[model samples]
Target: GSSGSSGEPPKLVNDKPHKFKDHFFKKPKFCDVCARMIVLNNKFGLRCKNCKTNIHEHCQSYVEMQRCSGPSSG
Candidate 1:
């Protein structure tokens, strides 16, 4: 069985970014990644439906410090 391969980073040990659907809110919002106001483009904003957290189009892949609180439940 060649199913065991060592010498690489632990498989499946990565935290993936939530699914960010195209959305917008009339009220003010802040990007969890940038920690600042969310200035959306073309009236569309980046938001994670799984965690209900706001993020910027630019900072979508940079949610380092802020971890997601799963909507799927722990």
Candidate 2:
């Protein structure tokens, strides 16, 4: 079997988005590599700086980013 793993988690950028430092909210899309919660601030409302994945800021990887907005749109 082929087990795809991203290895160790990535380091977080301790800056900006005043909310990340306080741990007040949880979006849904998190870091698949790290396990840290992704904060959906004003800027990156649904974009993950780590993997460029538009998730719920609470999940792990880019699950929502890969979805299509329409039907058979590629």
Candidate 3:
């Protein structure tokens, strides 16, 4: 089976409209990746400084990949 290369995650940047900052929520927020509500007390998440897109910490890597692919349709 061709298992994809498992390696280190890519480095991320704090570019405009895409700043990645770890956060703990005392309130609810929607995750851009999964489109699920990040209810209060969630342990890990990141927020965008520009567009204010909030996502789970695990989703950060996916977002970084999207950023490299170019502008998102959303």
Candidate 4:
């Protein structure tokens, strides 16, 4: 089952920080919401597997919810 209401800002998961290169960007990918640069190579960070969105460990949420909740709930 999905977390919270459908369309609710998807809850974030504290996933293992993927290799910075996993994002496939020249200067590292920025947070989907805040647009903060994920600096340093091979650093761990939060990953929303639903949308495959990568965000900083300390970012915020959004009005548009994520359709895929995560591994356990999706």
TM-score of each: 0.57, 0.21, 0.54, 0.39
Please report, in order, the local distance difference test score of every candidate based on alpha carbons: 0.67, 0.40, 0.67, 0.51
Clashing pairs in 3: none
Error of 4 at 23 (Å): 11
Q: What is the lDDT of residue 62 in candidate 2?
A: 36
Q: Which runs in model 3 stand beyond 4 Å of their true positions?
A: 1-17, 40-43, 68-74
Give residue 16's error in model 4 in angstroms. Answer: 21
lDDT of 4 by residue, 1-72 (tens): 556655666568544333222333345666766887777555455655344566665553341333334244
Ranking 2 against 3 by lDDT, winner: 3
- TM-score of candidate 3 relative to the true fold: 0.54
Pairs of residues at least 3 apart in sequence or in different chains that clash in candidate 4: 17-44, 17-45
lDDT of 3: 0.67
lDDT of 2: 0.40
1 or 4, greater by lDDT: 1
Clashes per candidate (backbone, < 3 Å): 0, 10, 0, 2
Query: Which should have the higher TM-score, number 3 or number 4?
Result: 3
Q: Per-residue lDDT tens digits of candidate 3, residues 6-66?
A: 8878756535335667767667887878888876455457877655677877777777745
Give per-residue CA lDDT, model 2, range 1-74, as digits (tens). Answer: 78876787775643322222223333455544355555546323344343344334444233433432322333
